[PDB]
Design a protein around this ligand. Structure first.
Ligand code: NA
Length: 142
């Protein structure tokens, strides 16, 4: 049993303000531009998550790759993801996936890593809609 995850990548726009967007609503981006040709790797982080849910902060170390994708013309990619997977003990668990932009990571329009805890609320068309946010900042330490 899988869900159909539709990812849409919109570039930063000074006039749209980046509130959260639920997985069961279509958001047109409010004029911001879809970003084409952005490569994402989707890691199955179910094991890393279930090692300790209360401590999970987005690590995908040693996580297997669930899928890769590249945004199209409309800034979108679609991927069916299993709603359950296995933890490190081999026990069946609700699945968690980490979306990581590998390319082009264009500065302030780089997507922040985000993770997704299935099953999610689906829209009427049956899709799960995610909208990666741009990174909080372009300076870093540590
Ligand atoms: Na696809």
């Amino acid at each position: 049993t899988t869900q159909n995850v539709v990812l849409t990548k919109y570039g930063f726009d000074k006039d749209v303000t980046a509130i959260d967007r639920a997985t069961d609503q279509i958001w047109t981006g409010d004029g911001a531009k879809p970003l084409q040709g952005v490569d994402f790797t989707i890691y199955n982080v179910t094991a890393n998550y279930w090692a300790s849910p209360k401590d999970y902060k987005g690590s995908f170390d040693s996580a297997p790759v669930a899928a890769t994708g590249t945004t199209n013309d409309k800034g979108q990619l679609t991927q069916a993801l299993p709603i359950q997977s296995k933890d490190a003990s081999g026990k069946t668990r609700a699945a968690v996936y980490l979306f990581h932009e590998t390319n082009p990571r264009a500065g302030y329009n780089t997507s922040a890593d985000f993770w997704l805890t299935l099953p999610a609320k689906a829209a009427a068309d049956g899709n799960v809609y995610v909208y990666p946010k741009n990174v909080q900042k372009t300076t870093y330490e540590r």
